Structure formats: C-alpha cells, structure tokens
C-alpha cells in the first residue's frame, strides 16, 4: 500500500489500459504520493511535461515546504513556472538559479531547459544553440524516466533550433526522433508543429498533412487545437490561398497579423492597413516585430520596411522566416550580392 523503481511503469500501464482517464487517474495518483520519493520527483516532471499545471503547482509547493533532492526539484521547477508566467524576469530567474547552487544532474539539466523555453517563447533565439550544448543527459544516472523525458524535450528543442537555423532536413530528423522517443501528447504536438513549419516554404501538401495530424491528436485540447489552426492559417497565407483558418474574433498579434496578410494577398489593402493600424499599438518581441515590418513592406511596397524586417529577424536570429522579406526584396529587383551580404553578416 509502494512505488515502482521507474515512473514509466505506472504511466505505460495507465496509457495502455485506461487511456481516456489518464488525467483523472494520474492526478489522483500523483497528488497522493509522498513528496520525498523519486516517484513524486518523477511525477513532477510528468506533470510539467504534460502541462498539468494544477498537479505540478501543488507538487512544487509541497516539495519546497517539507528532503534535499525534492526541495531542489521543487525550487527550480517553480522558477520555470514563474518565468513562463512573467512573474520574474530572465535576470531574476538566472540570479535565483545561481543562488540555488544546484547539485543534481537532473536540475542542472532543467535549469538550462527552462531558459531555452523562455528564449523560444520570447523570440530570442541567438542564445539557444550554445546553451543546449551544455546539457549532458548521460550524467543523469538515477532517474531514467527523467533522463528519457528530458531526452524528448531536447529533441524537440533541437528541432526548433535547426528550424531557426534554416537546417530543415535536420529539423525534421530531430522531431522524428522526438516522436519515436515519446508517448506524451505535448511533445507529439510540438513535433508535428515543427515538422509542418519546416515544410512551409516548399511542400504545401506535406506541411498541411503534418498540421492536420496535429489537429487529430489535439481534438480535446483547445490550446493545442488553436495552435494547429494558427499553423494552417499561416501556411495558407504563405501560399496566398483562400484561408479558411483566419480568426477574425481575436486581438492577439498572431491572429491579427494573419488577418492583414490575407487582406494583402487578396487585394484589400484598406482593410489590411486597419489591422496594421491596430498592431502598431502592441508590444512586439523582436521576432513578432520582424513579421510586422514584413507586412507593412508588402502593404506599402516600401523596401525600407523589408530592411527593418530583416534587421529584427537578424536580431532574433531567425534564419527561416527572414526568407519572406528576402523574397520580396528579390521581386523588387534588389542586387543579389546585397542579399548575399545581408545573409552573411550577423547581429551582435
């Protein structure tokens, strides 16, 4: 009345026998674990990886409250949660992680992973390649559930870094490795998203097929469902097709941009300027601003806007989406050697 020595044992049984009640059953099981154990530390990673924020936040608070290992796990998962909610800035997160004097290989791995998630989500890609290389999962010796879930996390992050570097075959290979390594829906979702994204400029049908695969596994999750709607919306704008995925009832930057893109695609510039006139009023991270300038460049047919667009793609270190204003400058007959030079040089 006892725990398995590896958390995957009970996970795999629940997924095999009771897949439609995984959350209900695991939420009950995890929240009754003794926080001092390796099972509870495993359950904390299970909950975060699944974005079961309710389960994870209770395990975090309990673990911090009252052993050595469990306290450390609670404290840096809490830093990840606070940073991902903007409760603390990156500087506070790094300062706190430093003050923890982290000892486990597991949390020294996760301390780097949580910064990687923050860089991805804030459109600040330049630090990621060097930071992810500091991770050495082979040092994780005791908890194999965590070594293997972290391995999946790293594959999906590597896939995103290769996408951001315009290394598209390698991007797809890493998400394919992630898919083969995992049974966690969250990682399958971002694997199919990233594979589909990598095909955006070359293969409409296969990009669509991957996003629709994402849709099929995301049915019952409104956030994941939204993501693939947004992915399909961007795909259809890139290819300047009729766009059945636009969200006209949204004031997010992501959805407003695609409204404008589609308006421009279909010769409704007054309506697009309205949208862009709404967008100038919102805080953009660098990568969002790069897209903003691209849209204004298309609306205005103004090369200066495409130059500003590549400036912020260079700043965010996005070597993929910069293909958009580069293609526009080409159509406007910009010097090929100029475009080669801009590709060569780097933001510092």
């Amino acid at each position: 009345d006892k725990t398995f020595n590896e958390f995957s044992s009970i996970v795999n049984i629940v997924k095999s026998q009771y897949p439609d009640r995984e959350y209900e059953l695991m939420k009950d099981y995890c929240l009754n674990l003794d926080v001092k154990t390796k099972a509870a530390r495993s359950a904390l990673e299970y909950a975060d990886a699944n974005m079961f924020f309710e389960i994870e936040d209770v395990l975090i608070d309990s673990m911090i409250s009252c052993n050595m290992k469990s306290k450390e796990y609670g404290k840096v998962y809490k830093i990840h949660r606070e940073l991902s909610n903007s409760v603390i800035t990156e500087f506070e997160a790094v300062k706190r992680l430093g003050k923890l004097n982290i000892k486990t290989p597991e949390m020294n791995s996760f301390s780097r992973l949580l910064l990687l998630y923050h860089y991805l989500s804030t459109g600040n890609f330049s630090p990621m390649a060097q930071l992810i290389k500091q991770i050495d999962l082979s040092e994780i010796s005791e908890n194999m559930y965590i070594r293997n879930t972290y391995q999946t996390r790293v594959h999906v992050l590597m896939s995103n870094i290769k996408l951001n570097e315009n290394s598209l075959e390698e991007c797809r290979e890493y998400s394919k490795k992630a898919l083969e390594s995992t049974n966690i829906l969250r990682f399958q979702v971002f694997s199919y998203l990233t594979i589909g994204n990598s095909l955006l400029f070359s293969n409409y049908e296969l990009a669509q097929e991957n996003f629709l695969k994402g849709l099929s596994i995301s049915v019952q999750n409104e956030n994941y469902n939204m993501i693939f709607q947004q992915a399909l919306c961007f795909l259809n704008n890139v290819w300047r097709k009729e766009n059945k995925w636009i969200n006209f009832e949204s004031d997010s930057i992501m959805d407003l941009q695609e409204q404008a893109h589609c308006f421009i695609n279909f010769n409704e510039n007054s309506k697009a300027k309205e949208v862009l006139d709404k967008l100038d009023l919102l805080v953009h991270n660098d990568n969002e601003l790069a897209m903003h300038y691209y849209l204004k460049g298309r609306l205005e047919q103004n090369k200066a806007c495409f130059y500003s667009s590549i400036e912020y793609f260079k700043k965010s270190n996005d070597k993929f989406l910069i293909r958009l204003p580069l293609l526009e400058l080409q159509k406007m007959g910009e010097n090929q050697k100029l475009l080669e030079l801009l590709l060569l040089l780097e933001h510092h």
């Binding site: 991805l120 989500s121 971002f190 994204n197 993501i227 947004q230 961007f234 930057i253 992501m254 941009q257």
Partner: peptide, 6 residues
C-alpha cells in the same frame, strides 16, 4: 505569425 513551441 507562425506558431512555435516545444
């Protein structure tokens, strides 16, 4: 824009 995640 383009959704991203991991």
């Amino acid at each position: 824009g383009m959704p991203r995640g991991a």
